[PDB]
């Protein structure tokens, strides 16, 4: 794989607080057009959280996080962020970064994405 994604920033956070996740994309990334954040609780489904279409900057959010989370890209760093505000215990999960050159279905569906990171754990205390 000459596209590698590495997430960081997870940890323990109190409900109502904020946390910023980072995902560094390395390799031959010039054709990437979608960057997605997904989350997966143990034994549960990997669900789309937020996605960014980099060509125009358009963002997509799951209903459960819209208004609380913000996905953004710093092109001068090849790094995509998930700023998570007003955190809730229901936000606890392993958070994955994902990337695609293009896709034929919803950019919030896991099967849209070719490249996946290793996950960073976010655990929100009530």
């Amino acid at each position: 794989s000459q596209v590698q994604l590495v997430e960081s920033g997870g940890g323990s956070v109190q409900a109502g607080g904020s946390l910023r996740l980072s995902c560094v994309a390395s390799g031959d990334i010039k054709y990437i057009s979608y960057l997605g954040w997904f989350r997966q609780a143990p034994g549960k489904e990997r669900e789309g959280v937020a996605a960014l279409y980099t060509s125009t900057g358009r963002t997509y959010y799951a209903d459960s996080v819209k208004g609380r989370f913000t996905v953004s890209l710093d092109n001068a760093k090849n790094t995509v962020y998930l700023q998570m505000n007003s955190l809730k215990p229901e936000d606890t999960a392993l958070y994955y970064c994902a990337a695609a050159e293009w896709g034929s279905q919803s950019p919030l569906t896991q099967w849209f994405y070719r490249y996946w990171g290793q996950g960073t754990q976010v655990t929100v205390s009530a």
Binding site: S12, Q40, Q121, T123, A126
Partner: protein
């Protein structure tokens, strides 16, 4: 019964009680209040026995899991830290000292299992459990093994078993639902199946216990073990060039070791509750206070963010905290006794083949 105008503190004999006494001396130098630190014999049973009569120390130090029952028995005072103080400790450490919705002790230190590895045999330890069979085949060709750890205790096997969905008791909004047990769900079945497959394929042995694994790692016979910070001193003496790191993932998810939080509770019968709060918040739970205790006997990882950031310059402590944050806080309820016994039987029966994984976990769930 407890004397007003001084502090009596009880802490176990395996802790840094002389360092804690130094914190007591600093408190006395500022306040005139004498602080007496004792390490009573048989402290685990002694505190509830004496506190039930309205006697004992002002402050008791013990692992948080026993404090749930002590709080239920009315032996511990509700503590009253303000928001600014609460923010100085990692959020998950406060979870460990909540009972009935109330904070009943101050978190001090944090303990969990980690992956311990021999750098000479294995400079790049595996990030995933799924890599271990292939790694063992490589090492067996050189007369070594990949991994040996205590399979006899659920405390050691649970991190893998529960990684993709197992849990002891469901915890939601500060309470454990004793009717919601996660022993026979799909995640626990998958983890125990992986464990039993390692045994079936001879990558691990069903009889490996604490002694067998400790001897094998410390003699350089196996590249990895799983153990806690209490084991590091023996590895030091063995001179193995070892590291301590994050436990392997399973299906991408973290291993979930049980977390123990050494905590300081205030006796409900103390007439010195405000002095105890001042001592614990403004003297002990500071960089200087924890350093004094740690210099006497290491605390491992600590709940106080500022001092943990110093201690975590030791990658072994950083790994302990990482595994702890990813782990399952040990439930502070008496139903844990039934959990240990049921899971112990399940792993014995699955690892020896008397029962399938599905049969073993179904029995442990009921």
């Amino acid at each position: 019964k407890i004397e007003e105008g001084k502090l009596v503190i009880w802490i176990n004999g395996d802790k840094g009680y002389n360092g804690l006494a130094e914190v007591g001396k600093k408190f006395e130098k500022d306040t005139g209040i004498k602080v007496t630190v004792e390490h009573p014999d048989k402290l685990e049973e002694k505190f509830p026995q004496v506190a039930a009569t309205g006697d004992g120390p002002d402050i008791i130090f013990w692992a948080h899991d026993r404090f749930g029952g002590y709080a239920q028995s009315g032996l511990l005072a509700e503590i009253t830290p303000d928001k600014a103080f609460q923010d100085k400790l990692y959020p998950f450490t406060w979870d460990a000292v909540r009972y009935n919705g109330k904070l009943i002790a101050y978190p001090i230190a944090v303990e969990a299992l980690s992956l311990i590895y021999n750098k000479d045999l294995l400079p790049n330890p595996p990030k995933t459990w799924e890599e271990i069979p292939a790694l063992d085949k490589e090492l067996k060709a050189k007369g070594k093994s990949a991994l040996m750890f205590n399979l006899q205790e659920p405390y050691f096997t649970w991190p893998l078993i529960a990684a993709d969905g197992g849990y002891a008791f469901k915890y939601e909004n500060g309470k454990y639902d004793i009717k919601d047990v996660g022993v026979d769900n799909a995640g626990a079945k998958a983890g125990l199946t992986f464990l039993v497959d390692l045994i079936k394929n001879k990558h691990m042995n069903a009889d490996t216990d604490y002694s067998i694994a400790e001897a094998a790692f410390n003699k350089g016979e196996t590249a990895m073990t799983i153990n806690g910070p209490w084991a590091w001193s023996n590895i030091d003496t063995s001179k193995v060039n070892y590291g301590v790191t994050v436990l392997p993932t399973f299906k991408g998810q973290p291993s979930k070791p049980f977390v123990g939080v050494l905590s300081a509770g205030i006796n409900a019968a103390s007439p010195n509750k405000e002095l105890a709060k001042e001592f614990l918040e403004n003297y002990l739970l500071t960089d200087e206070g924890l350093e004094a205790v740690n210099k006497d006997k290491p605390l491992g990882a600590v709940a106080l963010k500022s001092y943990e950031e110093e201690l975590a310059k030791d990658p072994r402590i950083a790994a302990t905290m990482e595994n702890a944050q990813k782990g399952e806080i040990m439930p502070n309820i008496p139903q844990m006794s039934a959990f240990w016994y049921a899971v112990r039987t399940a792993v014995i029966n699955a690892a020896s083949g008397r029962q399938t994984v599905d049969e073993a976990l179904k029995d442990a769930q009921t």
